[PDB]
């Protein structure tokens, strides 16, 4: 009862928007993007028979995605227009999807503005933070952003790279840091860290590999 | 021993078909460090592009085509391009340089508020692709110059004033951008110059296709690698097919000339 | 000052000054005085992402309006929250009448009227705070008073300006000065949860506190491993590590009074213990 | 088993020569851990200066001209009152300045650094008049004032209060909470650099620094106090006065404190 | 452009393009083009607190004041500099006339006048320099312009509003701007000690020159040693090494040039050298 | 020749003001602090018969060194007032020593002007930098202050402790990190590191102990 029977029913509930969460953030990095776990929340949120609007919030994206069912280009206009544009997409009504490409865009003084005016009982946010994209006094003490969304998300989808090839995880690190970008990167398969924050107030923690071509997902540590 | 440049599993360098889909919008980030610069590559994807295959590389009868090529730096004047690609013959009417290191800061900058810089070099790119829309490739070489020329330039200003509206804009963008910020011995740019090292971060999120040339760690017999990645974003393609083939090449430039092989 | 028999009040056993109760016998116990005395503030700090310590919160305001309700026990509470549904959630009851017991799944009977409880808003600029709650003690002049300050520097409730020294550390001293100022009649009680407060900061907060307590949920494993031991006595897990850092009076005179992973903590269905810690 | 307390050569702890000497000024650099508080050293500071010697820690009734200036911005004047009474120090011979009560009120509604610095050092200022040659001031976390005054930096904090402090003083003496370098895993270097400035300049002026800590390695023992040179010179006529560098352990507990030797 | 038998013009041996004397015949050949191919420009970097560059610089001036004195070899010197001394301390003499043999411990007889060389301040806003520069640039239209920046981004010389990226990086781009757009007849040469220089400025600065020299000091150990070995041979001893970080055009077309430790120098009586190491 | 004959004579010529050396810079920390390397400067420059008039500059000194021939309380006033006074003590006529307590009061930006009004044929600069005090945009490239003012510097004296205790280099770093600070520190037997910047250019180094007691350099 206090952790999970089967995660990998956890996970794909998560997935197909049945579980709710109100605001799920994701991870990621340029080892692995977001785009391929995303399609995964579309392919499970159709699969159990949903049918979900979807209004995508894009500061990064120029190539609309065939899913979505709005979709706002955030990079021109201001943050307060970006709201309200968010919300007349909107509503009891029925259940809508809000995917933003990236978080790493709004100011981090914004950011719980920005949660609080969105937030909505038929409203789920699915939301990317770049983990390896630097945020933009010294008695200031404001949490960075990445530990703030954290503190702020009811699910968090921390995603990894699988490595296949001849080099491990620090060769590819020191690579990484010379921007000598090795073969082996960004694959179909690769790996999720789940932490999911019950009502109760306890966060719990699963590892899965997921494939996103079959969309088989198993467990592992 | 020479091998061709192949990029995709379609056996393409430059697919006809980034050209025909609509709507349809394909970065490739290409990166290198300054001992191993970037100019036949430039040209052997105009050549591409223009005259059909990358025969400077690969290896021809007069021919004509739509094609066209927008070539824009802001480290190299007009000239530099011209002469190169007069040399290999590619018709001056199939391509147009845009210099944005000829009078650049006595004009577009001293005296003029960021945003008001940004959209005029945005303007002349919309006015060089206004006339060829769908058959059209633009390169545009190190344009992360202008997060150090402009005072106060963010990289999220930078991609959201000039860069992500210019891809909006195009069939194919080709980003070419100096490495050296990430190989300085004893000195971390993720947190020093992350100003800077975000803008290769998210430009690589965002292409298609990462290909990188770097000197050996570890003769006079080559010059460095070329590696062909993914980039962080799916191919915008009809064909559910066509992925990139990732590769590392060994090459010799000299006299030139170029040669790809394998290791 | 008070009715010299205000039935909130007690003599420390240590010290013989005046104390009251939280609302929690375990952590009046834990205090070290069977309550905390008069003119001194606790800190509850809590790990993790639980809330466990809302109970508290709740107990140290509930216990107060009981009092006040009773002999004489006049109190009055300040709230320092945009959380104006703290007051319906106060719990009701399952030296007579210094502690009770009460029952977290019932509520006060009535819910606390305007003249029992105050809320006071904490995006109000720190002078207008201080102000209101230096007037509010002015206007109960002969009240217990417990300030309760749930989830401080909770950044759905907190601005960002907030968190700048001048102007939390400011807002704390300011609230310490009134604590010291009203020694004979103010007790506070504050709560943080300490994962996302940077360091340095939390070193601030914890030096403005006359004590301070640590929360530790049990992880993962740990709670997986009770809920097998416990298989058939699920009334016997515990939640957690309840640490001490810091206690009234004893810490300031410099004794060394930190205690680390020596006392567990175990929300019941109706009562909140702490209690000796054993690896069963 | 007991020790008395002792700082320097000649056997004392607050040397007399220190009062008579002019124009010599000598900063003690006092620093604890708040778990490790040191109310009971500032009681004996105060009991040597005021009756003559460290009585707590090591009697008829006496008069003296010795005063002491008393200070903190963390603690509320009763505090001490209380705490000197319990000793039996002459009311008539302390002054206690109280940075605690009112003192946010008192200094918000855009009151600038610059008169917020002054006035605080014409307190001490007023206080040290009366007295002068035969007081000795005693200052508690004065470092707070680096987080409740904005944009205030530790050079500004040593220009228009400290140094001038001293500049006034026979012997000054700054107790500060070292907290900030105990954190683990944080660099109070690089991070908190306006902080810990502020104690490696004090260190750098004083004669002389006492160090309060718990043992990182019994309820036998509350915590060791060093007794270390400081970074400068003390400021004396006697060429052969110097710090008596040593390390106590020490109990406090029930009001009551005990040195001893490891 | 220039005149077509302009002293101090010859013909690249590797690209044939027109390329001019660094005055000093060594760093000519370690260019790889006998010289400076016009329309290009140089950076030497000196690590340690030593100033050797200093040599480099004067040799630059002072081969384009003896061409415009000699047959035509009309040239005009552009100094972005405080130190006007800099005029008064260049070597005299010790393709005939493309390159002489300078003698350090001579001067030039007369010293370069106003129209021969001209200096411009580098504490001026970077507008009101590349403005400056180009005017004399257009002033002068038929002849071969060097532009000299010795001791580039010196502290005791540079205001630190000049160290923002914006400014110096703006300020050698508009000069890089001017050595392509009028390429038939300017060259560029600056001078940098790197030691004080951030890592991040000093990769922009590399980018900005179209060929790096560094120049490496010998240390204390390795000096003594060389003293202990040429004890009988003191005219033996160099000074330190020469690292080839870029070259002109080959680098640019994608070569990989950088070649270190290959090369030392040698501070002479008189002259200047770069031996093989 | 390309290395001293006799460093510790080198060492005693800088310490008499013999030799030029118009800027020289101390490096201290907490562990040993400066002030008894000054002495040795004044001891050195009076027992060779010199007679130089010192100015002292007080960011941080109260008590008035009794060597000194004029003292400037730095601590109040601004910095154009603060060079006036420094220039108005300072003159051919003879050779002064100014003498500046702490360099980190000085703003990095303003360190090359202060040191180029200052200068002079008849100063020789005595200033100390602490190597421990933090100094107080993201396209700003101007060095950080130690890296200058090593760049500008003569000479420099880099003093270190010397540990006769129990505690090694890393144990006491660890202690000092959490300011609990050791006994046997600031010690009359301490450590230095000099660097005589030569006409040539050349920068050379050289180890010392020191003894501010007797005076007695020897070579490490």
């Given at each position: 009862?206090?952790?999970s029977h089967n995660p990998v029913i956890?996970?794909?509930?998560?997935?197909?928007?049945?579980?709710?969460?109100?605001?799920?953030?994701?991870?990621?990095?340029?080892?692995?993007?977001?785009?391929?776990?995303?399609?995964?929340?579309?392919?499970?949120?159709?699969?159990?028979?949903?049918?979900?609007?979807?209004?995508?919030?894009?500061?990064?994206?120029?190539?609309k995605p065939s899913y979505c069912t709005?979709?706002?280009?955030?990079?021109?206009?201001?943050?307060?227009?970006?709201?309200?544009?968010?919300?007349?997409?909107?509503?009891?009504?029925?259940?809508?999807?809000?995917?933003?490409?990236?978080?790493?865009?709004?100011?981090?003084?914004?950011?719980?503005?920005?949660?609080?005016?969105?937030?909505?009982?038929?409203?789920?946010?699915?939301?990317?933070?770049?983990?390896?994209?630097?945020?933009?006094?010294?008695?200031?003490?404001?949490?960075?952003?990445?530990?703030?969304?954290?503190?702020?998300?009811?699910?968090?989808?921390?995603?990894?790279?699988?490595?296949?090839?001849?080099?491990?995880?620090?060769?590819?690190?020191?690579?990484?840091?010379?921007?000598?970008?090795?073969?082996?990167?960004?694959?179909?398969?690769?790996?999720?860290?789940?932490?999911?924050?019950?009502?109760?107030?306890?966060?719990?923690?699963?590892?899965?590999?997921?494939?996103?071509?079959?969309?088989?997902?198993?467990?592992?540590? | 021993?020479?091998?061709?440049?192949?990029?995709?599993?379609?056996?393409?360098?430059?697919?006809?078909?980034?050209?025909?889909?609509?709507?349809?919008?394909?970065?490739?980030?290409?990166?290198?460090?300054?001992?191993?610069?970037?100019?036949?590559?430039?040209?052997?994807?105009?050549?591409?592009?223009?005259?059909?295959?990358?025969?400077?590389?690969?290896?021809?009868?007069?021919?004509?085509?739509?094609?066209?090529?927008?070539?824009?730096?802001?480290?190299?004047?007009?000239?530099?391009?011209?002469?190169?690609?007069?040399?290999?013959?590619?018709?001056?009417?199939?391509?147009?340089?845009?210099?944005?290191?000829?009078?650049?800061?006595?004009?577009?900058?001293?005296?003029?508020?960021?945003?008001?810089?940004?959209?005029?070099?945005?303007?002349?790119?919309?006015?060089?692709?206004?006339?060829?829309?769908?058959?059209?490739?633009?390169?545009?070489?190190?344009?992360?110059?202008?997060?150090?020329?402009?005072?106060?330039?963010?990289?999220?200003?930078?991609?959201?004033?000039?860069?992500?509206?210019?891809?909006?804009?195009?069939?194919?963008?080709?980003?070419?951008?100096?490495?050296?910020?990430?190989?300085?011995?004893?000195?971390?740019?993720?947190?020093?110059?992350?100003?800077?090292?975000?803008?290769?971060?998210?430009?690589?999120?965002?292409?298609?296709?990462?290909?990188?040339?770097?000197?050996?760690?570890?003769?006079?017999?080559?010059?460095?690698?070329?590696?062909?990645?993914?980039?962080?974003?799916?191919?915008?393609?009809?064909?559910?097919?066509?992925?990139?083939?990732?590769?590392?090449?060994?090459?010799?430039?000299?006299?030139?000339?170029?040669?790809?092989?394998?290791? | 000052?008070?009715?010299?028999?205000?039935?909130?009040?007690?003599?420390?056993?240590?010290?013989?000054?005046?104390?009251?109760?939280?609302?929690?016998?375990?952590?009046?116990?834990?205090?070290?005085?069977?309550?905390?005395?008069?003119?001194?503030?606790?800190?509850?700090?809590?790990?993790?992402?639980?809330?466990?310590?809302?109970?508290?919160?709740?107990?140290?305001?509930?216990?107060?309006?009981?009092?006040?309700?009773?002999?004489?026990?006049?109190?009055?509470?300040?709230?320092?929250?945009?959380?104006?549904?703290?007051?319906?959630?106060?719990?009701?009851?399952?030296?007579?009448?210094?502690?009770?017991?009460?029952?977290?799944?019932?509520?006060?009977?009535?819910?606390?009227?305007?003249?029992?409880?105050?809320?006071?808003?904490?995006?109000?600029?720190?002078?207008?705070?201080?102000?209101?709650?230096?007037?509010?003690?002015?206007?109960?002049?002969?009240?217990?008073?417990?300030?309760?300050?749930?989830?401080?520097l909770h950044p759905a409730m907190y601005?960002?300006?907030?968190?700048?020294?001048?102007?939390?550390?400011?807002?704390?001293?300011?609230?310490?000065?009134?604590?010291?100022?009203?020694?004979?009649?103010?007790?506070?009680?504050?709560?943080?949860?300490?994962?996302?407060?940077?360091?340095?900061?939390?070193?601030?907060?914890?030096?403005?506190?006359?004590?301070?307590?640590?929360?530790?949920?049990?992880?993962?494993?740990?709670?997986?491993?009770?809920?097998?031991?416990?298989?058939?006595?699920?009334?016997?897990?515990?939640?957690?590590?309840?640490?001490?850092?810091?206690?009234?009076?004893?810490?300031?005179?410099?004794?060394?009074?930190?205690?680390?992973?020596?006392?567990?903590?175990?929300?019941?269905?109706?009562?909140?213990?702490?209690?000796?810690?054993?690896?069963?």
């Amino acid at each position: 009862a206090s952790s999970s029977h089967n995660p990998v029913i956890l996970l794909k509930r998560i997935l197909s928007l049945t579980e709710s969460s109100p605001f799920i953030l994701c991870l990621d990095s340029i080892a692995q993007t977001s785009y391929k776990l995303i399609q995964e929340f579309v392919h499970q949120s159709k699969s159990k028979g949903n049918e979900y609007p979807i209004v995508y919030i894009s500061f990064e994206t120029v190539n609309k995605p065939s899913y979505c069912t709005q979709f706002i280009d955030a990079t021109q206009m201001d943050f307060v227009h970006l709201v309200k544009q968010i919300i007349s997409y909107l509503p009891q009504a029925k259940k809508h999807m809000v995917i933003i490409d990236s978080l790493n865009y709004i100011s981090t003084e914004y950011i719980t503005r920005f949660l609080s005016e969105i937030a909505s009982p038929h409203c789920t946010m699915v939301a990317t933070y770049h983990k390896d994209i630097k945020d933009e006094d010294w008695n200031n003490n404001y949490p960075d952003k990445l530990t703030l969304l954290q503190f702020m998300a009811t699910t968090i989808v921390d995603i990894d790279v699988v490595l296949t090839g001849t080099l491990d995880t620090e060769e590819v690190s020191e690579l990484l840091n010379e921007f000598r970008i090795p073969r082996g990167l960004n694959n179909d398969i690769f790996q999720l860290r789940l932490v999911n924050k019950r009502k109760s107030g306890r966060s719990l923690e699963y590892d899965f590999i997921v494939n996103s071509n079959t969309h088989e997902y198993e467990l592992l540590s | 021993q020479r091998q061709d440049l192949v990029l995709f599993s379609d056996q393409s360098v430059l697919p006809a078909h980034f050209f025909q889909d609509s709507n349809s919008h394909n970065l490739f980030f290409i990166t290198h460090q300054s001992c191993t610069q970037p100019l036949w590559m430039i040209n052997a994807l105009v050549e591409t592009h223009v005259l059909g295959s990358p025969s400077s590389l690969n290896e021809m009868l007069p021919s004509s085509t739509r094609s066209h090529a927008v070539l824009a730096s802001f480290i190299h004047e007009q000239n530099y391009f011209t002469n190169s690609l007069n040399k290999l013959k590619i018709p001056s009417n199939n391509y147009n340089v845009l210099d944005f290191l000829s009078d650049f800061i006595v004009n577009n900058i001293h005296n003029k508020p960021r945003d008001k810089i940004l959209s005029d070099v945005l303007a002349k790119f919309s006015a060089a692709i206004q006339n060829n829309p769908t058959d059209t490739i633009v390169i545009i070489e190190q344009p992360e110059l202008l997060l150090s020329l402009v005072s106060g330039l963010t990289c999220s200003e930078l991609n959201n004033k000039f860069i992500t509206p210019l891809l909006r804009q195009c069939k194919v963008l080709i980003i070419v951008s100096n490495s050296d910020i990430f190989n300085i011995d004893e000195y971390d740019a993720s947190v020093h110059s992350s100003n800077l090292q975000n803008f290769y971060k998210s430009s690589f999120i965002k292409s298609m296709i990462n290909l990188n040339l770097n000197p050996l760690k570890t003769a006079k017999d080559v010059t460095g690698s070329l590696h062909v990645c993914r980039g962080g974003a799916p191919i915008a393609t009809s064909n559910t097919s066509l992925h990139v083939v990732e590769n590392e090449y060994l090459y010799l430039n000299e006299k030139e000339s170029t040669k790809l092989f394998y290791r | 000052g008070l009715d010299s028999s205000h039935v909130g009040v007690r003599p420390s056993p240590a010290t013989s000054q005046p104390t009251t109760s939280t609302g929690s016998a375990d952590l009046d116990s834990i205090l070290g005085h069977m309550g905390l005395p008069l003119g001194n503030s606790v800190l509850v700090e809590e790990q993790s992402t639980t809330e466990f310590h809302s109970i508290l919160g709740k107990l140290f305001a509930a216990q107060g309006i009981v009092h006040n309700r009773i002999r004489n026990g006049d109190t009055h509470v300040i709230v320092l929250s945009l959380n104006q549904m703290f007051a319906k959630e106060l719990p009701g009851i399952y030296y007579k009448d210094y502690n009770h017991q009460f029952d977290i799944t019932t509520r006060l009977m009535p819910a606390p009227i305007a003249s029992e409880l105050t809320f006071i808003a904490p995006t109000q600029p720190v002078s207008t705070i201080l102000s209101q709650i230096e007037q509010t003690i002015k206007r109960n002049d002969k009240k217990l008073i417990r300030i309760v300050i749930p989830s401080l520097l909770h950044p759905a409730m907190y601005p960002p300006k907030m968190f700048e020294s001048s102007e939390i550390i400011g807002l704390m001293h300011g609230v310490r000065s009134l604590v010291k100022k009203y020694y004979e009649r103010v007790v506070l009680f504050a709560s943080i949860s300490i994962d996302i407060i940077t360091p340095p900061l939390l070193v601030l907060l914890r030096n403005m506190f006359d004590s301070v307590i640590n929360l530790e949920p049990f992880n993962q494993e740990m709670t997986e491993f009770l809920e097998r031991v416990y298989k058939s006595q699920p009334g016997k897990i515990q939640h957690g590590l309840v640490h001490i850092l810091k206690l009234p009076v004893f810490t300031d005179r410099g004794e060394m009074r930190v205690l680390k992973s020596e006392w567990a903590f175990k929300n019941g269905r109706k009562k909140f213990e702490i209690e000796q810690w054993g690896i069963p």
